């Protein structure tokens, strides 16, 4: 009584996925996952100027350029032997940290709300599925199913502004958005003015107050009617961490630590232990057993037998890991927003205090959202602390000089997830580049063993009632902010 | 009255040009999609997906042939029968599936159009996805309209991404000719199919740096004071109004704050490299 459901395009995520399902008894029990989509940046990088890969990593992706410029710059700094200043390290993260603000507020509304929220009725918010299970649908109260439509609705219409101001704050320091300019090797090429640091400062406000006042008490309120969705989209509740947005000049200490969480238990992050497998992937690689990113090859094959995706599978100690804000905050485990902490109380009655007091409803569709939320208010803070720390004047930038032979890895974590660049030089030349991605450890197929990837693995037991309106596939994969550009580059 | 219907596809993208949209100014997104165009198909924003998402492009692209504008975002690779760019899979009236790759996608769609607008560098003129060691044979649309022998009126909106009023400017201009073309001619392009009104300023010519460079003052590091140009600075061979119109909003731009890397340009990103060396 199987039946399959190929959805190609699963639009409302960034580039180029398809999701194959099978369904029995009303309920997902078979999932593929697929990338599409292939460039090469890492064979378009060889034997260039290794300076050149903080411009070219962005167009992987224009959704989250800085992280990809983050871990590129660090692996060039790493290689080149500079350190950085004070300034020019609080400097990256209030480049960075506005686009993380302007990437989880752009994934909730405009990739993921279209599947809760009604639209008008005028493309692109329709066509939709005819049986959509909206908050239109799922409210029985028509006022109260009205007002709390067109109370998201309108949020989902005031985040276009908040998003666009967010990139005004990333162009303050970084020249302009998508594709800074201003994060190089050695810091960061413009040190902060008094003028433009208030300028910066007076924007933040009003996201941080859309964030506080509208965005989290839309995900509670949400959470509070898709109760269901917390107890479904669960996966292999295993993540890892690589450590964001340093907050010392020795990268000792972050606002958000790495370390695994796999099985149940913590340890910590061990870079040593990542390798790619590629037994369902369209890659060769010359030996097997999978590869460390440190002698990562990079030769694709779309006629290789019993391939489905350009996405590699990284694997940590062998186990498919998930990441991404459920990750971090579950690593983490910070103290909720005064707002979490109220409305959790108030519209579920639960007592939470940190992160993990969630439990087993961390690790579902809401949970994911969730997670996302509360971080995008704990970076705010955090943001709201850089703009006191950052130093009018200071210098941002030491010079350096292309080394003949060395190598360098950037770690840091994009929006989405826990990212890596790997930089080996040779003749003052890119010799291999190597990026292990965000949604590559997300949206991978099956390893050589067969195990899923965590998108995979999450859609099993994914309830799908009616067959013709498959809506809680696309609402799980949703959930993990999937960037098919970022998985593949 | 009338909105202009859009067929918005995405081959060997990054996202950045449709990121770059959104962040339109006076008009603002918000009025451009409810007042300005009808955004028809778009893979990262559309409310529909799979078979429900491909059936009304192709519905649309019926229903509004010759009267809609293709635009492309992202490079069309044709190595291995087109295989690097699969953008979606169309179920036939048996249950068969079959893959629809970018090539086959944009020789479908294009002689439908009304225009095809290649916003981005990469749909242009290739790109980074084009650039030197890529193995996907990655094309810009000029190219494959060349070798498919498609002749449909080409307009290109470079840049890496393409300022939003670049995208808007050219839509808009378009639309109005359209509407009445003895009223509003077709904006002017230059050799490469880009409008004059927005690529027509060399960027060297027109940057506050000039006295600078002409008293050969130049900044010894990124944060000294001078001319960019030891730096790496590509305004000298770039043709774009970004320090008339500056970026963001007015924020900021790549000269004031670092370097011009040449991203509008034909030979963007290999003719511009390396960054960080002066031309
Ligand atoms: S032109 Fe640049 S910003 Fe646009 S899709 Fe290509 S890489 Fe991305
Ligand atoms: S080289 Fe660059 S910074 Fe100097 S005057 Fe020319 S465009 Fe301006
Ligand atoms: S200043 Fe140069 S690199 Fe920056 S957007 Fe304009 S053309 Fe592109
Ligand atoms: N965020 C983000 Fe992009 C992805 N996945 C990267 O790295
Ligand atoms: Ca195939
Ligand atoms: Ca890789
Ligand atoms: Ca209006
Ligand atoms: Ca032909
Ligand atoms: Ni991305
Ligand atoms: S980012």
């Given at each position: 009584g199987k039946v399959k459901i190929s959805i190609d395009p699963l639009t409302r995520v960034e580039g180029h996925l398809k999701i194959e399902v099978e369904v029995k008894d009303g309920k997902v029990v078979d999932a593929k996952c697929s990338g599409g989509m292939f460039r090469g940046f890492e064979q378009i990088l060889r034997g260039r100027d290794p300076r050149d890969s903080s411009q070219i990593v962005q167009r992987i992706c224009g959704v989250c350029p800085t992280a990809h410029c983050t871990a590129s710059v660090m692996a060039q700094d790493d290689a080149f032997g500079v350190k950085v200043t004070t300034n020019g390290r609080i400097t990256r993260n209030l480049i960075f940290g506005a686009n993380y603000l302007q990437s989880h507020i752009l994934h909730f509304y405009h990739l993921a709300a279209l599947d809760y929220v009604k639209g008008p009725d005028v493309s692109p918010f329709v066509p939709r599925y005819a049986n959509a299970d909206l908050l239109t649908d799922r409210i029985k109260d028509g006022a109260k199913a009205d007002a709390t439509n067109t109370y998201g609705l309108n949020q989902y219409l005031k985040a276009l502004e908040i998003r666009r101001?967010?990139?005004?704050?990333?162009?303050?320091?970084?020249?302009?958005?998508?594709?800074?300019?201003?994060?190089?090797?050695?810091?960061?090429?413009?040190?902060?003015?008094?003028?433009?640091?208030?300028?910066?400062?007076?924007?933040?406000?009003?996201?941080?107050?859309?964030?506080?006042?509208?965005?989290?008490?839309?995900?509670?309120?949400?959470?509070?009617?898709?109760?269901?969705?917390?107890?479904?989209?669960?996966?292999?509740?295993?993540?890892?961490?690589?450590?964001?947005?340093?907050?010392?000049?020795?990268?000792?200490?972050?606002?958000?630590?790495?370390?695994?969480?796999?099985?149940?238990?913590?340890?910590e992050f061990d870079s040593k232990l990542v390798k790619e497998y590629v037994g369902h992937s369209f890659f060769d690689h010359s030996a097997p057993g999978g590869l460390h990113y440190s002698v990562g090859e990079t030769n694709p094959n779309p006629d290789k037998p019993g391939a489905y995706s350009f996405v590699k599978a990284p694997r940590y100690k062998d186990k498919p890991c998930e990441v991404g804000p459920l990750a971090r905050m579950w690593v983490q485990n910070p103290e909720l927003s005064p707002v979490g902490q109220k409305l959790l109380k108030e519209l579920y009655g639960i007592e939470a205090k940190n992160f993990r007091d969630l439990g087993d409803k961390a690790f579902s569709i809401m949970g994911r959202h969730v997670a996302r939320a509360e971080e995008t208010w704990l970076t705010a803070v955090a943001v709201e602390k850089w703009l006191k720390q950052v130093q009018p004047g200071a210098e941002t930038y030491v010079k350096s000089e292309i080394p003949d032979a060395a190598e360098g890895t950037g770690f840091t974590e994009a929006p989405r997830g826990a990212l890596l660049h790997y930089l080996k030089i040779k003749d003052k030349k890119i010799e291999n580049y190597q990026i292990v991605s965000a949604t590559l450890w997300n949206a991978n197929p099956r390893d050589d063993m067969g195990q899923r990837g965590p998108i995979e693995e999450a859609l099993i037991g994914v309830p799908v009632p009616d067959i013709k309106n498959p809506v809680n596939v696309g609402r799980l994969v949703r959930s993990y902010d999937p960037x098919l550009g970022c998985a593949v580059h | 009255?009338?909105?202009?219907?859009?067929?918005?596809?995405?081959?060997?993208?990054?996202?950045?040009?449709?990121?770059?949209?959104?962040?339109?100014?006076?008009?603002?997104?918000?009025?451009?999609?409810?007042?300005?165009?009808?955004?028809?198909?778009?893979?990262?924003?559309?409310?529909?997906?799979?078979?429900?998402?491909?059936?009304?492009?192709?519905?649309?692209?019926?229903?509004?042939?010759?009267?809609?504008?293709?635009?492309?975002?992202?490079?069309?690779?044709?190595?291995?029968?087109?295989?690097?760019?699969?953008?979606?899979?169309?179920?036939?009236?048996?249950?068969?599936?079959?893959?629809?790759?970018?090539?086959?996608?944009?020789?479908?769609?294009?002689?439908?159009?009304?225009?095809?607008?290649?916003?981005?560098?990469?749909?242009?003129?290739?790109?980074?996805?084009?650039?030197?060691?890529?193995?996907?044979?990655?094309?810009?649309?000029?190219?494959?309209?060349?070798?498919?022998?498609?002749?449909?009126?080409?307009?290109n909106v470079p840049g890496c991404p393409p300022h939003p009023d670049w995208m808007v400017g050219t839509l808009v201009a378009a639309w109005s000719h359209v509407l009445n073309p003895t009223e509003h001619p077709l904006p002017e392009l230059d050799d490469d199919g880009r409008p004059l009104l927005f690529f027509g300023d060399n960027i060297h010519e027109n940057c506050p740096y000039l006295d600078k460079y002409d008293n050969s003052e130049f900044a010894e590091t990124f944060t000294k004071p001078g001319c960019k140009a030891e730096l790496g600075c590509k305004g000298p061979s770039t043709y774009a109004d970004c320090a008339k119109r500056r970026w963001n909003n007015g924020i900021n731009w790549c000269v004031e704050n670092a370097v011009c890397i040449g991203c509008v340009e034909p030979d963007f990103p290999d003719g511009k490299s390396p960054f960080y060396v002066a031309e």
């Open positions: 101001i967010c990139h005004e704050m990333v162009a303050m320091f970084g020249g302009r958005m998508p594709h800074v300019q201003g994060m190089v090797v050695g810091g960061a090429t413009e040190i902060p003015t008094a003028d433009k640091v208030a300028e910066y400062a007076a924007r933040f406000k009003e996201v941080q107050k859309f964030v506080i006042e509208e965005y989290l008490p839309l995900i509670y309120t949400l959470g509070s009617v898709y109760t269901d969705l917390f107890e479904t989209g669960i996966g292999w509740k295993n993540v890892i961490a690589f450590g964001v947005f340093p907050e010392d000049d020795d990268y000792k200490t972050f606002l958000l630590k790495p370390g695994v969480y796999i099985d149940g238990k913590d340890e | 009255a009338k909105k202009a219907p859009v067929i918005w596809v995405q081959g060997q993208g990054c996202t950045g040009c449709s990121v770059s949209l959104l962040n339109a100014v006076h008009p603002r997104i918000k009025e451009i999609l409810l007042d300005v165009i009808s955004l028809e198909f778009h893979p990262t924003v559309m409310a529909s997906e799979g078979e429900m998402a491909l059936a009304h492009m192709y519905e649309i692209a019926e229903k509004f042939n010759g009267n809609f504008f293709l635009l492309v975002e992202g490079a069309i690779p044709t190595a291995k029968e087109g295989r690097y760019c699969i953008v979606g899979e169309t179920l036939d009236a048996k249950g068969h599936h079959h893959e629809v790759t970018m090539m086959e996608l944009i020789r479908d769609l294009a002689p439908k159009s009304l225009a095809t607008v290649a916003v981005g560098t990469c749909s242009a003129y290739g790109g980074i996805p084009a650039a030197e060691g890529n193995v996907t044979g990655s094309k810009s649309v000029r190219d494959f309209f060349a070798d498919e022998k498609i002749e449909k009126l080409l307009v």
